[PDB]
Amino acid sequence: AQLRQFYVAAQGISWSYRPEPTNSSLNLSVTSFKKIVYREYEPYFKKEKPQSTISGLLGPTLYAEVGDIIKVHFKNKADKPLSIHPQGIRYSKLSEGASYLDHTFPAEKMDDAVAPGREYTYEWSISEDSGPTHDDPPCLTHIYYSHENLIEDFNSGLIGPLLICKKGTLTEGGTQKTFDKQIVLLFAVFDESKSWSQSSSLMYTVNGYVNGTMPDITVCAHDHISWHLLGMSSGPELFSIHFNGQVLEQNHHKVSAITLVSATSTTANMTVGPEGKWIISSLTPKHLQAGMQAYIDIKNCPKKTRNLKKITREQRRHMKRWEYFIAAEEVIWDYAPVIPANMDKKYRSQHLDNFSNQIGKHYKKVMYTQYEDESFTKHTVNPNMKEDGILGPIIRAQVRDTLKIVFKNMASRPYSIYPHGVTFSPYEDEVNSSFTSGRNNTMIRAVQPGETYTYKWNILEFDEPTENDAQCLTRPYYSDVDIMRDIASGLIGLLLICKSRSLDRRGIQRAADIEQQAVFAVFDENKSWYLEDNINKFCENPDEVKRDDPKFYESNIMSTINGYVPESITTLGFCFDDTVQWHFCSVGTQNEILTIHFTGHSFIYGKRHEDTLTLFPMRGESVTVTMDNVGTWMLTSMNSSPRSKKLRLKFRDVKCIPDDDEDSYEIFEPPESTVMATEDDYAEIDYVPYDDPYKTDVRTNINSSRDPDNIAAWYLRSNNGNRRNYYIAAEEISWDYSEFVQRETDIEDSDDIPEDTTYKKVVFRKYLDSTFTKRDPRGEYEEHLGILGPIIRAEVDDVIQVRFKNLASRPYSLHAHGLSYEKSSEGKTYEDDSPEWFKEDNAVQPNSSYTYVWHATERSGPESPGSACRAWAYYSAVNPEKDIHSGLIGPLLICQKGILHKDSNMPMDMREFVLLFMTFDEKKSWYYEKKSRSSWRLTSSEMKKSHEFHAINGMIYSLPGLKMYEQEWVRLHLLNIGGSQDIHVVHFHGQTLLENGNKQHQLGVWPLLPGSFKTLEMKASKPGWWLLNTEVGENQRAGMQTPFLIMDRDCRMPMGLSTGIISDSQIKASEFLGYWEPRLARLNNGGSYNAWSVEKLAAEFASKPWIQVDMQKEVIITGIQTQGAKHYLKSCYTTEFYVAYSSNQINWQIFKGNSTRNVMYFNGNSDASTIKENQFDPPIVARYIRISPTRAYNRPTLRLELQGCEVNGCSTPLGMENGKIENKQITASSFKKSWWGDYWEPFRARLNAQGRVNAWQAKANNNKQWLEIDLLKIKKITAIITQGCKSLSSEMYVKSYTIHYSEQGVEWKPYRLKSSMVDKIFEGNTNTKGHVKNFFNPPIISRFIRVIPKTWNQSIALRLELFGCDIY
Ligand SMILES: *[C@@H]1O[C@H](CO)[C@@H](O)[C@H](O)[C@H]1NC(C)=O
Ligand SMILES: *[C@@H]1O[C@H](CO)[C@@H](O)[C@H](O)[C@H]1NC(C)=O
Ligand SMILES: *[C@@H]1O[C@H](CO)[C@@H](O)[C@H](O)[C@H]1NC(C)=O
Ligand SMILES: *[C@@H]1O[C@H](CO)[C@@H](O)[C@H](O)[C@H]1NC(C)=O
DSSP: OOOEEEEEEEEEOOOOOSSOSSSOSSOOOSSOOOOEEEEEBOTTSOSBOOOOSSOSSOOOOOOEETTOEEEEEEOOOSSSOBOOBOSSSOOOSSSOOBOSOOOOOGGGOTTTOBOTTOOOOEEEEOOSTTSOOTTSOSEEEEEEBOBSOHHHHHHTBOOEEEEEEOTTOBOTTSOBSSOSEEEEEEEEEOOGGGSSSOOOOOOOEETTEESSOEEEEEEOSSOBEEEEEEEEESSOOEEEEEETTOOEEETTEEESEEEEESSEEEEEOOBOOSSEEEEEEEOSHHHHHSOOOEEEEEOOOGGGOOOOOOOOOOOSTTOOOOEEEOOEEEOOBOSSOOSOOOSTTSSOOOOOSOSSSSSOOOBOOEEEOOBOSSSOOSOOOOOSOTTOOSOOOOOEEOSSOEEEEEOOOOSSSOBOOEETTTSOSOOOOOSSTTOSOOSSOOOOOOBOTTOOOEEEEEOOSSOSOOTTSOSEEEEEEEOSSOHHHHHTTTOOOEEEEEOOSOOTTTOSOTTEEEEEEEEEEEEOGGGOTTHIIIIITTSSSOSOOOOSOSSHHHHSOEEEETTBOGGGOOOBOOBSSOEEEEEEEEOSTTOSOEEEEESSOOOOBTTBOOSEEEEOBTOEEEEEEEOOSOEEEEEEESOOOSSSOOOEEEEEEBOOOOTTOOOOOSSSOOOOSSOOOOOOSSSSBTBSOOOOTTTSOSSSOSSSOOOHHHHHHHHTOSSOOOEEEEEEEEEEEEOOSSTTSSSSSSOOSSTTOSSOSOOEEEEEEEESSSSOOSBOOOOSTTTTTTTSOOOEEEOTTOEEEEEEEEOSSSOBOOEESSSEEOTTSOOOOOOOOOOTTSSSSSOBOTTEEEEEEEEOOGGGSOOSSSOSEEEEEEEOOSSGGGTTTTTOEEEEEEEOSSOBOSSSOOBSSSEEEEEEOEEOOTTTSTTOOOSSOOOOSSTTSSTTTSOOOEESSSOSBOOTTOEEETTOEEEEEEEOOSOSSOOEEEEETTOOEEEOSSSOEEESEEEEOTTOOEEEEEEOOSSEEEEEEESOHHHHTTSOEEEEEEEOSOOOEEOSSSSSOSOGGGEEESOOOSSOOTHHHHOSSOOSSOSEEOSOOOSSSOOOOOEEEOOSSOEEEEEEEEBOOOBTTBOOEEEEEEEEEESSSSOOEEOOSSOSSSSOOBOOOSSTTSOEEEEEEEEEEESEEEEEEEEEESSOEEBOOEEEEESSSOOSBOSSSSTTSOTTTOEESOOOEETTTEEOOSSOOOSSOOSSOOOOOOSSOSSSOOEEEEEEEEEEEEEEEEOOOOOTTSOOOEEEEEEEEESSSSSOEEOOOTTOSSOOOEEOOSSSSOOEEEEEEEEEEEEEEEEEEEEESSSOOOOOEEEEEEOO
């Protein structure tokens, strides 16, 4: 529980990015100088502490543990205002360090920017909420920076690691007890162009050094190393960190490559190998083009005192030599098997010398080939290896095993093989086998033609497969001499690390079909090593390289799946109740991430079924899909950019019920139960007799016309039932992008709105009838949805038959992820060979409605112990990128049983916020009619192409409806539909996000990969206005900044109408009755004429006399305490009513929240004299409130009191009402003592007291008296309210009071306006029972409060109350 005090200061240096701290006087530098960074100091800023050899620009690590309050003294020294902003802490408004309009007072604006040469102090209390849980690494790593100017401060330096660990796991010096060494790395992309001194620069660095020249990291042998990898970049950049020859453990997954996104952080294991020096690099092709490397040195330390654990079995069982002969060979290859060319390339040329059309494409690749004999004299290997194209033979390696690799280069250029993630185990030590590795342990002889040599690979007990992992892991292998132009060449491979023990080089399990190799390789022929002979010699053109391309650099590059273009890959085939093993890998020099989608089928990923998978460059990912829905489907890439879109693999799914036939085609197999071992000609007949799914469906009968009830009949074969009917339609409306931030709310970059921000686009709108004649108005729950369509929700095992009617000018359809469905209910129109009866769902014509029947099942539900609900999405699928853009998109939520109300399907457990972090390229949208356009000067001038309106739900700034209470669990359904090379790192200011499930991981920010629908849980920390934003600077500066509001926990306070705060003139009504004035209606109790009534109730509608309450200030109101008024055996009360709210007196909105009607009809009060309390489920913010009765007993008559809290601040009783403020805290000078009155003691002044109420009194009745409030700590006091005392056959109260406040209790600093040193006179009260509320223009941030009754009517009396919250 120790307090950790750190000292930092942002100071200027002269950095050169070169490895040298001091090597020579003269400097030859890549263009950058004079940056600013902050470094740690000794206490009281004596002199700078020595910096580590590794951390050049990386700041000091501010280590801490939960329960430790850390104070950072920030004495700025650079010549620019700056600040420090954390990332994963429940920091307050005084230590946030971020400058936006939070409507906070000037006392709390000092943290946003400190002037140079002026000090401050940052306090970040760490609690159990923002700390590591079980199943979580001991130390969580975050990054803190300067929030004054995120674009300019980062690029000029100003970065620091931030570790928050568990309890008792941190030493005095900040080192974990269990880990021998901890190393902090910063893969940052510094840009000196957007810096203090603009010099053209794009250097790619680790820590503060460029070109992989950071000094080597020296570690001992077989050591436990904990890594803290940070990645930051001003623009969207992706880091794919790879530890060559090593394996790490990240989030209970043993992986060789760690993937990071800009402005993120990660921690992981590492167990070091015996000897030798390795290298770590980045697998991103543009990152590998530059250096971005670090060298890790492993030296056998004699003084290490190695335990010699020797944890190994070394017993003959479960191991075999498994010799593999993979001698590479130079071949000719056809990227497009246009003519039926099968079984690889035994026959070589058959060439027409034309790149297009028939064979003769002549893309001369060097692929790996498998042999069987020592001398390689005969090929000797020819498995049925069709549809496995340019791929090295697959190596299946068990745990504990070893294997042998032999090459014989039959090409001209020397080549090699690099086991990527295959020498993951500590590579066997060598003395001469290094083969001039270049001091990197990289075994590359670069085998010459007619040369042969052998590699040794192995594995220890600790292995990449883990308990929470797939059966077999995927890891590729390639060459090292030139990565780009050999990946562009045929030197490609893929091998598996199978945890399953029973493989024996025959097969893993002959019950799961193995469609092992599906590799999206992008071979760039313009980068091919054999370009000169290929391109020129075999065309009707002269001899020029011609790499400047009108088309060539785009025409020659071909995206293929296993070396075959998807336009000529024959359809696949798997039968019913079959498991299929898929091993994907993105290896082509695309530099862009790739996502894939299974139509009608879902994976198993961890313990989730994801239905969509994202691929990173040179990282292997393996999933297993089980066939469940009959018919034909496909795999497709959802990136769907005009570059590299057509990547589709069509696979069938048939009931393979005729098991009597023995002849099963060997590969591409319908697998029998018994395990025997101890293009064209694929998806055709002689496959086990496959029943035509289009004429033998049991789910759908095609003899008669399609009926949704008939289809849902077979779906509802169980007791679940629960049909959920949704009537939805597509309508074209004029949409606002910036109308909420035109002149108010958050800052705007679209100054003066050069365009109207009123683009026309089509959206989803829900209806209640099948006639589509009446609309269902959007309530307050969904007012944050914006452009998103209605929330379609259902339970598990349910069937959702949805009726969709097109009301636009173009055909639109409806396609839903995750949920199971027939081909008769789908939105995608591909070549599925379907009849015309399955093609009526593909496109829905205007003025026509089609009913879709989806069946929620076990695959579409959340985990067993995980989050309650999980999110999918539905969108028009006639043309996706033209349909998700233009506004056709919506959320689809599925939850476990017993969570949604039957009549209205809304979960009552937790609030749900659906946010679609996507940007809308309006050029892609339809209705993009350009008139008098092209007036823009640059290609990035106007927001039609320069800015894609980076928005959260269609609104660039200040998305409304984001309201939640503090200390409240809310469920966040973060979505990202399709997209392309755009990963959003979602950051909530002052909040930490928990990833629920079977592991319970806690994060500060979440990188949102495209196509991922991640559901999280968040607990609000403190009230106020906090900023929701993506953490990338350049996308945040121009959008994605929604200030969301966190309300007080106790927002149930009388907003007036009973105490007397609301003036008599602030209340009006539509009609009268005679002496039943609207003035009397506000009072909750008392009075002979005590309420408001009218003559009679209307008939056609409410059309009822309303009553309006004025506030002169927007406040949060949560409920209303309505009651009747009975008098002389006559009773009257409002039985039913609805409430309308508005900020001004023009735009009136009727309240409807969680109600199965057009508007809410509150249940009213059954009998008079009984206070009935109602609650508004989302609290409403407004200034005027109109409540109008709809039904009542006899003549309507109403008394009303409003409950709520003040907005944009802490307005809660700090005490003085409940027992929170002890009697021993507060006191005063002198009390009146009388025998009959006993003691008129202090500490009895409380907001409401009765009997012998003791408000306050004085035994002298003079000017110098006061009442003192002694809070335990420094608190923020906002408002004070006074109410005098009881009549007591007299009339005693105060007229005017003056305030002095102090912290130590001796200073007594008066509170006054900036006029002069005279106490400000505060308004008193006239009523004996009335409450008069006084606000503070600056809030008194102090401990002690003195209030002095300067002006008094009689013996001084006072029953005060205080409001506010704790500071930290
Ligand atoms: C790190 O590795 C050890 C053993 O390999 C494992 O027990 C632990 O759970 C891993 N994760 C940590 C320490 O966060
Ligand atoms: C060194 O780094 C620069 C960027 O700062 C990069 O352009 C250059 O290619 C690197 N050097 C080599 C040999 O790749
Ligand atoms: C659809 O019907 C409406 C009549 O309600 C008609 O005005 C419209 O022209 C028709 N066609 C389209 C494409 O909306
Ligand atoms: C929401 O409405 C349902 C019925 O419409 C009701 O049972 C439930 O109590 C409501 N929830 C809240 C928080 O008012």
